[PDB]
Amino acid sequence: CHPTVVYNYLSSRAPNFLRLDDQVSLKLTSAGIGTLMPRPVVQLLDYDL
Amino acid sequence: FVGELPVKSVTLNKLGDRNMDALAEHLLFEHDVVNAQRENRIFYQRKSA
Amino acid sequence: EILIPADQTSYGANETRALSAPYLFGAPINMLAPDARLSTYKRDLALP
Amino acid sequence: FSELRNFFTGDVVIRDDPFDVWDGVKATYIPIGVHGVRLDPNGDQPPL
Amino acid sequence: LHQSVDPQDLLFGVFGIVPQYQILNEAVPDFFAGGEDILILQLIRAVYDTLSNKLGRNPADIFHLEEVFKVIEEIVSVLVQQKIDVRKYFTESMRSGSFSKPRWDNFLRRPVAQRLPNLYSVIMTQADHVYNYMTQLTHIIPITDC
Amino acid sequence: MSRQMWLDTSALLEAISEYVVRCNGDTFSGLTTGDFNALSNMFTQLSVSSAGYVSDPRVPLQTMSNMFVSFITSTDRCGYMLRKTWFNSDTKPTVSDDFITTYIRPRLQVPMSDTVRQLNNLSLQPSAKPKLYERQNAIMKGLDIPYSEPIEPCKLFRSVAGQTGNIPMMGILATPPAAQQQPFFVAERRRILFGIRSNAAIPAGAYQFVVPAWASVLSVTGAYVYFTNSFFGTIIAGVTATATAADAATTFTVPTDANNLPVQTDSRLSFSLGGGNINLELGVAKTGFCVAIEGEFTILANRSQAYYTLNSITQTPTSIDDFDVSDFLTTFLSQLRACGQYEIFSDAMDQLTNSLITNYMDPPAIPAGLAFTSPWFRFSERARTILALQNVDLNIRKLIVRHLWVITSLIAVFGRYYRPN
Amino acid sequence: MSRQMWLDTSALLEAISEYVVRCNGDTFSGLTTGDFNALSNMFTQLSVSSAGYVSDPRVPLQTMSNMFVSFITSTDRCGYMLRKTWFNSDTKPTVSDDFITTYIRPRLQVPMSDTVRQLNNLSLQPSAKPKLYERQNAIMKGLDIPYSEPIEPCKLFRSVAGQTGNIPMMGILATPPAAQQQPFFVAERRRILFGIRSNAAIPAGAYQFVVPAWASVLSVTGAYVYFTNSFFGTIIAGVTATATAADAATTFTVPTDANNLPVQTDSRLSFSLGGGNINLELGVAKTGFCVAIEGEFTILANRSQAYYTLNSITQTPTSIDDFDVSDFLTTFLSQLRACGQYEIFSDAMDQLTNSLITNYMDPPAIPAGLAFTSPWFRFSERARTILALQNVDLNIRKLIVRHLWVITSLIAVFGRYYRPN
Amino acid sequence: MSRQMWLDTSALLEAISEYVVRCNGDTFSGLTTGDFNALSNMFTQLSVYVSDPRVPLQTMSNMFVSFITSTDRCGYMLRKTWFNSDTKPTVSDDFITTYIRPRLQVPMSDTVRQLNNLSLQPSAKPKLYERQNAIMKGLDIPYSEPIEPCKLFRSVAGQTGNIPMMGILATPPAAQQQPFFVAERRRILFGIRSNAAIPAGAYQFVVPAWASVLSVTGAYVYFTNSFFGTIIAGVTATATAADAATTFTVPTDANNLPVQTDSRLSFSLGGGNINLELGVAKTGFCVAIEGEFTILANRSQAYYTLNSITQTPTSIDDFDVSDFLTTFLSQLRACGQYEIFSDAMDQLTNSLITNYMDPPAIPAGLAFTSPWFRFSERARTILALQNVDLNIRKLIVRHLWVITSLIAVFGRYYRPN
Amino acid sequence: MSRQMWLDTSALLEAISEYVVRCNGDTFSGLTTGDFNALSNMFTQLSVSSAGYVSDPRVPLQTMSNMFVSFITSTDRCGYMLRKTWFNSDTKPTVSDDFITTYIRPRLQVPMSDTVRQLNNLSLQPSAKPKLYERQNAIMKGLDIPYSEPIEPCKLFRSVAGQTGNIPM
Amino acid sequence: QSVVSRTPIPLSKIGLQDVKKLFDINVIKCGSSLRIVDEPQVTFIVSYA
């Protein structure tokens, strides 16, 4: 997906009293047209097993 | 070209086995070939998306 | 009162309330009181 | 010949300039905001 | 895991422990460690399905377990990039290293509950499409039924 | 065990069925549709002897039905279910029986299940032909039904002072009258009728009609309201359905809407029969008239407790429908005949039923004057019969019907795969 | 290829439809719903050409339909499936045709499909309005249909010794009677009607009615039985609908139930018109009477063969429905009119139909006297005509109807995306 | 914002509902069904809570009535332009920014839609979305979708109404009258009533505009004397096995169509007019067509555009909107606002009519005889103003409808308490 | 700013009042009352833009009022509050004015605060003489007042066709 | 640590020529060992690979 997306995701996750590091934010938000990066996902397993 | 009309055609001679142009020289009469070869340029082209 | 019947236990015995009441808050071994201090933060992160 | 061509006719769409792909990013979070003094809600505790 | 405890030790605990009236949360959690095994079991189970579903019936109706396991293994292995050994997870106890069908059985009695974590779901969903496509190409290859 | 546990399992079986319908002829070789995935899941959660994929789901399903019949047949076994304590509370019973142990277990995800259910009553297009589950929860726990679920008002019907019946009035309604009679309120499948019959003109002006207790929970939408002369396709007499374009307009009102609702108009109406009485205003004198309310009928919010808790019942005897069980029993019955058990099963049911009524009465003994006119599966009637024992407190009569219904419904759900051999 | 291959593939298209409907307006940007995934994979299964979500599912379905029309149009090509063989055997044919090999081939998963199918018959709430697939299996392989599937009685009607028709009897039931006449048995959409009509009273007592062949497989649940005077919304004469609250209760019995079934009661009944005659017991003499059974009708378990296999047909000529084909054709027809092939097709269909009949009679020649009153898509009518040929004996006629039906159904399914413009 | 945006979002909410129904009592513990996965990912798309899906929905409904109540806020939606174009609106109302955004994936959505019109068994009782599109963008409706003829009715030249015509058909005729054409829920009736016999021969009936878009399948055509279950006088259903055949003809089908026969018919009254051929003189007759009715392909425009409306006043239905209001209406009374809403609702419909006529002033003689949710009535009232040009009226009805449906969808979860 | 932001702050000032009353003559040395801590914590939150801890309220409280009077006195400043929009919507406006930025800002905890409000209408013995907050919400957002809250009927009186007045009669 | 951004199946590029062909094309000039013909039928036989 486009880096912009990654930012919106990670940044909205930031828990109370925190923000996504700047440099990371900027590199992510500065990405231009045609650039892509892997979608961030929350990995949860089936503990019960 | 195709008449005085410029166009971007698929370079058939680079597809060896599937070089429809060469495949057409098997036709019987002088022109049925050229005719076929021309139809080729008209159909195998790089078109705008 | 039986909380968890003998049938459904690895060990033999019935899991009665008298076998839970003394220990801790007195909650049935069944439903124990969980430390939810970190809970807010968790919920907001999609964690279990 | 026409039919032989029309059989071997199929289109594909490709992007002129390849996508520029990146690696993941370490999602580092840092503190923000100012904290004030919050006093205990219950007040002095009973003795002994 | 087990160990023994003397409630009597609590005596000096009562007369000797000195509170510090304050909690020292100096450490930091490694909140996510420990899944390695679960993941593998989770995949082992999910692959069993993807195999069975396509077979149209319980693999064990026509295959010796040793056969089914070798397949599940290779597949799981590719998904984790590590040599996997299904057998070891199902023993009667930590004591013996001997495999136990009855435990493998109970493991299968519990159908896939949640969706596989995204990284693997993509891999599998993709394979499943290819298998579907590839399959339709069967009516192309030179094989007649008699 | 727990009444809940039985309902949960019923729900599962009910859904196993649902997904089987969903998969019929949608099971191709290359793909495994989400639907089948889910079906497989349930199939596995229900199977004893089967390891993973259930090769032949007929087998485990059959085995289950067989044991169920074996269970619900022996009063010794299913006895615990026929006590007033099982229907009134969620008390885990201390009863060990192969069946219960193996198949009856909690199967619904709490608290999610409930929240989805609530969220539903509020949704746009609920199922028009709902599962037994919903009805079970209504009749047993007295829970709400979806606000937009439609129903045929004639089922809602119960007996009140004036009329001791709905269908019966048909005969009377077809007989020319002697003098101006009292008002009538009948109900069909897709519409409600009310009016006044007479042999001589009825003056123009106002007339109140008491909305009977049973219909005071109805509601209509996309309804046409007009003057008619047939009831269930049977001509009503002592009523004129004529009128002229010149006629003065006839309108009625409901205590819920400040505006008059026109009659004999092409306009689609929406109003509710809850709140009091409807006030008809005959614009022109007519020799007996009959108003028709034809549209989609629904049960007002939070009022479904009347219908399903048998609370809209005031007289004795009384007409009573069957909450549709009859419609579900079909399959099971079909199976029972195909293997001769039809007879035996019946005899075992009268037993079930007798033993049930028994426990609901102090002192523990069958009441006198109790004789059924129909078999266990014609519930509609047996419910009337039971709701007619004037020697037994009213409320206990109701409970008995409710309770027996649930046991019947369960049978309708669990027996279906029965192939005793 | 083999008949099976056609059915399998049809079932796929029917399933593609199903999932298209499921996806309509449920295709949001960030969601790939299970429904869409399946639909997507099915497209792939049809024409391998469109792999991926990318492809415009329209063109590959279009191409498919197109070839189907030019296939089912040229008797030279589709000739093979018009032969006697194709309909009653599973022998893979020796056809070397483009369409066949590209689209017709085993598509269902065996044996799971078949297992799921049987499990369905026992499902609680089967599809109210089932796919063409089901009928296809029924009419061709004589398979079973679900036990709880509803049916509209009148569709089941066929001519018998007494009545030559069901609808036509309406005009008669209207005309006042000369004297007491023989009984009548008619069917509507939602109810069954029987009785005796006279100009003079009929004494109280026992009367017996022979359930006609066609209705001997009916079964009702949640039914009200009362006295009426209308048929399809027409007034029946020579029948009293009068009754007093005093009257002696009327009752009837079915060979299937030991107990008496009450008439004119608010009780929901369950019984089956199978295995015998109906014993009506008039409690009071009535100057002509008509009993009405109104409820949910269903064909008895495993007896559906009669209807779908054309066994219920005894006379010549008879009345006959189209197994609802008419309903499915709509789309395709609408598509023909849209591109102006409605006529060209109707012509080709006529030869298809003609050659089909030809191959059923030895020696190879259109029987004489074969004149068609309606076009290819008014089945019910052309069926009547086929079933009216005195030349060929009953069975051959019946088969022809059946075999023709399947080809017609196949059309209804395969041509819908037709656009050669 | 955009008219489209509202639709897309509405459509999403209707999806939520659909899947909520699909999940009811199919939420077992050892299993995550496909339906529930989807329903979950859907709640996710609403608010920019995953625990109790009731709270984000409540919040949404609440903010919605809050918005649809104040003319100052939802005013932008009440202008002639909103219903007309796909122009991005300049509005800063946080209800809009939070919930109304594009939701449907293009072009895939449209593709599936058309592919649907061609489906064998479409939804018998469709969502509002389909209707919304039909009434606003004038898109097609599925070819096999059933419809109750009577809704399609509209006032025409001779007949002023449908249901009203009943009481008249019930009065024994003076002398041979003009032909009639009524419609019920499941059938269509046409004929000629008289007090004296009608010769045998040819008789032409011309199908009124509203019915010229109708088509039937699995149809029985016979003679009756009942309309909506009311006796029709001046007509006879009498016949004899000996009677000569009675057939009729339709422009679209070259062959004869039998009457009082047990055969199931298919034909479309859309060529102009039925051409009945009476076989035996009858003392007033009424032919009936009972079957499955659909609207001919690419002709539903008429009905949904209010373009089958010629006369005035005309009697019209409400496109079933009433049936969807039930829920929201229930929640309104539950929290005692049924009154307040009905008033704010009046200003909405009032302010809407305004923007449609220049100069900007409520027409003379605008008197509503019914409340906001008895649409079918207000609809005719709007369609009755001799003041305002006709077409403008039609738009007002269509535009108001869309907003009404929107309410019917978005408010359901309302709970202020 | 937000009509909500004003209400929120008002609610806080009212809470401060409430706790000042609770603490009156219950301030004993050597004893930190739970009430006094809450009173103290609220003060802090008032001057949250300039402090993280407060010694004596005498001053910031005064300052706040003085500035407030200086605010609703000048149309130029508090003008934004006199517009039709401020009473209708919750749109966060932008006003460059020391008073607004320094004191008017979100105070109540959402959504927990609302939950409690609802649970209250159901309470057995609600406040007999409620705070202004309740009234403010009723009159502005039209929310519900507690079911058991007593009221003097004469206040409820309004004019109707029959009798024009209540006291006049 | 809750978030993981990894790529499931890294995809690789390829040229048209490298596509796996599924059909073979043979050309023949059909004549006769009976009559003498000068218009042989240049025919194209397409078979699976």
Same domain, H228 and H255: yes
Same domain, G352 and G389: yes
Asked if J3 and A38 come within 8 Å (Cβ–Cβ), the reply is no
Beta bridge partners of D21: A36
Q: Identify the CA nearest to F282 among candidates F240, F251, F254.
A: F251
C-beta separation of H374 from H294 below 8 A: no
Shortest distance, CA A19 to any CA of chain E (angstroms): 19
User: Under the phi-then-psi rule, with left for phi > 0, alpha for psi from -120 to 50, and beta for the rest, what region is I107?
Assistant: alpha
Same domain, F157 and F273: yes
Q: Which helix (H) or strand (E) holds F272?
A: strand F269-272
Distance, CA of I144 to CA of H334 (rounded, Å) = 14
DSSP string, F115-129: HHHHHHHTSSS--SS
Asked if B23 and J27 come within 8 Å (Cβ–Cβ), the reply is yes
As given in the structure block, the two tokens for residue H363 are 């027409």
Same domain, H150 and H227: yes
Place of tokens 């995935």: F37
Which of helix, strand or coil describes residue H2? coil
* Closest Cβ opposite residue J5 in set D7, D12, D24: D24
Distance, CA of E72 to CA of E87 (rounded, Å) = 11
How large is the C-alpha radius of gyration of chain C?
15
Distance, CA of H403 to CA of I19 (rounded, Å) = 49
Please, what sign has the CA dihedral across residues H354, H355, H356, H361?
positive
Distance, CA of H15 to CA of H39 (rounded, Å) = 8
* CB burial of residue F362 (10 Å; 0-12, 13-18, 19+): exposed
Beta bridge partners of H287: H190, H223
Which CATH number belongs to the domain containing residue H228 in this structure? Answer: 2.60.120.170
Distance, CA of H57 to CA of H409 (rounded, Å) = 12
Distance, CA of G80 to CA of J35 (rounded, Å) = 35
Residues in chain C preceding a C-to-N separation beyond 2.5 angstroms (breaks)? none
* Closest Cβ opposite residue E56 in set G37, G41, G112: G112
Q: What does the CA dihedral F2, F5, F7, F12 come to, rounded to 10 degrees?
A: -170
Same domain, F286 and F308: no
∠ CA E10-E13-E16, nearest 5°, is 150
Beta bridge partners of C4: C15
Q: Which helix (H) or strand (E) holds H192?
A: strand H187-192
* CB burial of residue G205 (10 Å; 0-12, 13-18, 19+): exposed
Asked if B24 and D8 come within 8 Å (Cβ–Cβ), the reply is no
Distance, CA of F142 to CA of F306 (rounded, Å) = 9
Distance, CA of A7 to CA of F306 (rounded, Å) = 55
Distance, CA of H93 to CA of E113 (rounded, Å) = 42
* Crossing angle for the helix pair H390-410 and H338-356, to the nearest 10 degrees: 150
φ, ψ dihedrals at G329, nearest 5°: -60, -40
Chain F residues near residue G229 by CB distance under 8 angstroms = 174, 233-235
As given in the structure block, the two tokens for residue A26 are 């900027």
β-pair type (A18-20, D29-31): antiparallel
Same domain, H35 and H60: yes
Shortest distance, CA E108 to any CA of chain H (angstroms): 13
Beta bridge partners of G302: none
Distance, CA of I114 to CA of F208 (rounded, Å) = 46
Q: Determine the straight-line distance between the first and last CA of chain A, rounded to whole angstroms.
A: 32
Asked if G61 and H253 come within 8 Å (Cβ–Cβ), the reply is no
C-beta separation of H269 from H250 below 8 A: yes
Alpha helices in chain C (DSSP H): 39-43
Shortest distance, CA J6 to any CA of chain D (angstroms): 6
C-beta separation of G202 from G284 below 8 A: no
Chain F residues near residue H34 by CB distance under 8 angstroms = 34-35, 37-38
C-beta separation of F162 from F203 below 8 A: no
C-beta separation of G252 from G264 below 8 A: no
Shortest distance, CA B14 to any CA of chain D (angstroms): 16
Distance, CA of F146 to CA of G77 (rounded, Å) = 55
Same domain, H256 and H308: no
C-beta separation of H163 from F226 below 8 A: yes
Please, what sign has the CA dihedral across residues J25, J27, J32, J37?
positive
CA within 13 Å, CB half, G28: 26
Total domains in the fold of chain G: 2
Distance, CA of F80 to CA of F5 (rounded, Å) = 14
Which of G286, G302, G318 terminates a domain? The answer is G302
* CB burial of residue F323 (10 Å; 0-12, 13-18, 19+): buried
Which of F302, F323, F351 terminates a domain? The answer is F302
Q: Which helix (H) or strand (E) holds D29?
A: strand D29-31
Distance, CA of F219 to CA of H152 (rounded, Å) = 24
Beta bridge partners of F34: none
As given in the structure block, the two tokens for residue J7 are 């790529």
C-beta separation of F104 from F1 below 8 A: yes
Domain that holds residue G167: 146-302
For residue C40, which amino acid is it?
A: T
Q: Does H30 touch chain E (CB under 8 A)?
A: yes
Beta bridge partners of H285: H192
C-beta separation of F407 from F356 below 8 A: yes
Distance, CA of G318 to CA of G213 (rounded, Å) = 13
Q: Does J31 touch chain B (CB under 8 A)?
A: no
Show Cβ contacts of residue I17 under 8 Å, excluding neighbours closer than 6 positions.
none
* Chains contacting chain E through 3 or more C-beta pairs under 8 A: A, F, G, H, J
For residue G104, which amino acid is it?
A: I
∠ CA F381-F382-F388, nearest 5°, is 95
Q: Identify the CA nearest to G379 among candidates G137, G155, G209.
A: G155
Which of helix, strand or coil describes residue E65? helix
As given in the structure block, the two tokens for residue H211 are 């019915």
Show Cβ contacts of residue F379 under 8 Å, excluding neighbours closer than 6 positions.
F322, F325, F326, F404, F405, F408
Neighbours of G92 (CB within 10 A): 12
* CB burial of residue H179 (10 Å; 0-12, 13-18, 19+): middle
Chain E residues near residue H32 by CB distance under 8 angstroms = 113-115
Q: Identify the CA nearest to F307 among candidates F296, F329, F322, F292.
A: F322
Same domain, F151 and F298: yes
As given in the structure block, the two tokens for residue G48 are 């391998």
Q: Identify the CA nearest to H280 among candidates H245, H249, H234, H256.
A: H245
Beta bridge partners of J29: J42
C-beta separation of E56 from G109 below 8 A: yes
C-beta separation of G220 from G298 below 8 A: yes
As given in the structure block, the two tokens for residue G280 are 């009506």
Residue of chain G whose Cα is closest to the Cα of E137: G48
Place of tokens 């087998």: F59
Would you mind telling me the total number of residues written for chain F in this entry?
Answer: 421
C-beta separation of G355 from G76 below 8 A: no
Chain A residues near residue D22 by CB distance under 8 angstroms = 3, 31, 35-37
As given in the structure block, the two tokens for residue H323 are 């049936």
Please, what sign has the CA dihedral across residues F240, F243, F247, F249?
positive
Per-residue exposure over G27-43, b if at least 16 CB sit within 10 Å of its own CB, e if not: bbeebebbbbbbbbbbb
Place of tokens 């429905």: G321
Asked if D24 and J46 come within 8 Å (Cβ–Cβ), the reply is no
How many cross-chain Cβ pairs, B to J, lie less than 8 Å apart?
15
Shortest distance, CA D6 to any CA of chain J (angstroms): 13
Which of F277, F302, F327 terminates a domain? The answer is F302
Distance, CA of F288 to CA of F271 (rounded, Å) = 24
β-pair type (G205-210, G261-262): unpaired
Distance, CA of G36 to CA of H367 (rounded, Å) = 49
Shortest distance, CA H339 to any CA of chain I (angstroms): 14
Q: Does E56 touch chain G (CB under 8 A)?
A: yes
As given in the structure block, the two tokens for residue H242 are 């000996």
% helix, strand, coil for chain B, step of 5: 50, 10, 40
Asked if B23 and J25 come within 8 Å (Cβ–Cβ), the reply is yes
Same domain, G114 and G127: yes
Please, what sign has the CA dihedral across residues C33, C37, C40, C42?
negative
Same domain, F2 and F38: yes
Q: Identify the CA nearest to H82 among candidates H294, H369, H413, H351.
A: H351
Distance, CA of J35 to CA of G216 (rounded, Å) = 73
Same domain, G120 and G268: no
Place of tokens 């049924």: H338
Q: Which helix (H) or strand (E) holds H391?
A: helix H390-410
Chain A residues near residue J7 by CB distance under 8 angstroms = 38
Q: Identify the CA nearest to I151 among candidates I167, I135, I128.
A: I128
Asked if H31 and E110 come within 8 Å (Cβ–Cβ), the reply is no
Shortest distance, CA C39 to any CA of chain A (angstroms): 12
Asked if J6 and D8 come within 8 Å (Cβ–Cβ), the reply is no
As given in the structure block, the two tokens for residue G335 are 């598509």
Q: Identify the CA nearest to F148 among candidates F257, F222, F258.
A: F222
* Closest Cβ opposite residue F167 in set G34, G35, G264: G264
C-beta separation of F218 from F192 below 8 A: yes
C-beta separation of H180 from H157 below 8 A: no
Show Cβ contacts of residue C27 under 8 Å, excluding neighbours closer than 6 positions.
C20, C33
β-pair type (J23-30, G205-210): unpaired
φ, ψ dihedrals at I89, nearest 5°: -110, 165
CA within 13 Å, CB half, A42: 12
Distance, CA of G186 to CA of H385 (rounded, Å) = 51
C-beta separation of G133 from G284 below 8 A: no
Shortest distance, CA A16 to any CA of chain J (angstroms): 16
Q: Which helix (H) or strand (E) holds H35?
A: helix H34-46
DSSP string, E67-90: HHHHHHHHHHHHHHTS---HHHH-
Neighbours of F200 (CB within 10 A): 10
Show Cβ contacts of residue H107 under 8 Å, excluding neighbours closer than 6 positions.
none
Q: Determine the straight-line distance between the first and last CA of chain E, rounded to whole angstroms.
A: 62
Q: Do chains I and F touch (3 or more CB pairs under 8 A)?
A: no
What is the SS3 assignment for chain G?
Answer: CCHHHHHHHHHHHHHHHHHHHHHCCCCECCCCCHHHHHHHHHHHHHCCCCCCCCCCCHHHHHHHHHHHHHHHHCHHHHHHHHCHHHHHCCCCCCCCCHHHHHHCCCCECCCHHHHHHHHHHCCCCCCCCCCHHHHHHHHHHCCCCCCCCECCHHHHCCCCCCCCCCCCHHHHHHCCCCCCCCCEEEECCCEEEEEECCCCCECCEEEEEECCHHHCCEEEEEEEEEECCEECCEECCCCCCCCCCCCCCCEEECCCCCCCEECCCCCCEEEECCCCEEEEEECCCECCEEEEEEEEEEECCCCCHHHHHCCCCCCCCCCCCCCCHHHHHHHHHHHHHHHCCHHHHHHHHHHHHHHHHHCCCCCCCCCCCCCCCCCCCCHHHHHHHHCCCCCCCHHHHHHHHHHHHHHHHHHHHHCCCCCCC
Chain F residues near residue C2 by CB distance under 8 angstroms = 92, 94
Best E49, E110, E115, E121 member to test H by mutation, with max H CBs in 10 Å, is E115
Chain D residues near residue A27 by CB distance under 8 angstroms = 25
As given in the structure block, the two tokens for residue H37 are 């996965």
Same domain, G409 and G344: yes
Which of helix, strand or coil describes residue F242? coil
Q: Does D31 touch chain A (CB under 8 A)?
A: yes
Asked if A37 and J6 come within 8 Å (Cβ–Cβ), the reply is no
